[PDB]
Amino acid sequence: ATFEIVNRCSYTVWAAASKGDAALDAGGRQLNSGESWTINVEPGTNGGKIWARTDCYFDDSGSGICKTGDCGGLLRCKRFGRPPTTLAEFSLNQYGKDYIDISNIKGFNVPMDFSPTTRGCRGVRCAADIVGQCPAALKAPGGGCNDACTVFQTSEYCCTTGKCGPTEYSRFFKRLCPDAFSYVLDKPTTVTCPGSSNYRVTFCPTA
């Protein structure tokens, strides 16, 4: 499947793509403002994620750091990124269908649209100014808006036991972005697409 990753933000981002135990395609790449990078994701990929990283430095071997979403210091991510990270999440060719969502469960750094480029389903979007509006307690000094699990490490926020409810913090994310997961047991906003759909992830879709 193809995923065109488009940076419409006014700032550079470093796109990342992983399924947690491995890179998807090259795993990461710089996107200056306006650039597009198309990756190929193997059919059947379960639990894939795409995210933006901000404020990165990498040396000539691709080792460094980012202020959000850093994946072990690598340009070419093999693992998931450090919160806060807005997440484009997908599982492809799962009993003949694809499943997509956006999640704020690991916080928010960059606004995103995640849409099919092929027929048969709708896209999802979280494009509100969550960083600007972030509650004081959740503001990340390194940049972004942390989720409450990251900040407070409680069973309720992290939903450790599978017993959790919505919280004042999750409701903030949900108010700003109804169409994204705000906590682990949120009412799902997953979209079912035809198996082997193709996609576009757009950072900063509305500016």
Residue numbers in the entry: 1 to 207
Authors' own words:
Among the sweet-tasting proteins, thaumatin is ~100,000 times sweeter than sucrose on a molar basis and about 1,600 times sweeter on a weight basis. In the present study, three mutant X-ray crystallographic structures of thaumatin (K78A, K106A, and K137A) were determined at resolutions of 1.07, 1.07 and 1.01 Å, respectively.
The final model of K137A thaumatin was determined at a slightly higher resolution of 1.01 Å. Compared to K78A, K106A, and recombinant thaumatin, one tartrate molecule was reduced in K137A. The threshold values of K78A and K137A were 220 and 230 nM, respectively, and sweetness decreased by ~5-fold when compared to recombinant and plant thaumatin. The normalized B-factor ratio decreased by 1.09 for side-chain, suggesting that the flexibility of the side-chain of Lys137 was substantially reduced. The reduction of flexibility at the interaction sites indeed seems to be consistent with the difference in sweetness, since the threshold value of K137A (230 nM) and K78A (220 nM) is higher than that of K106A (140 nM). The superposition between K137A and recombinant thaumatin showed no obvious differences in r.m.s.d. values except alternative side-chains and C-terminal Ala207 as with K78A and K106A. Three lysine residues (Lys78, Lys106, and Lys137) are still tightly interacting with the negatively charged residues on the sweet receptor, that is, NZ of Lys78 is 4.5 Å from CG of Asp433_T1R2, NZ of Lys137 is 5.0 Å from CB of Asp215_T1R3, and NZ of Lys106 interact with CG of Asp173_T1R2, suggesting all these tight interactions reflect a good complementarity.
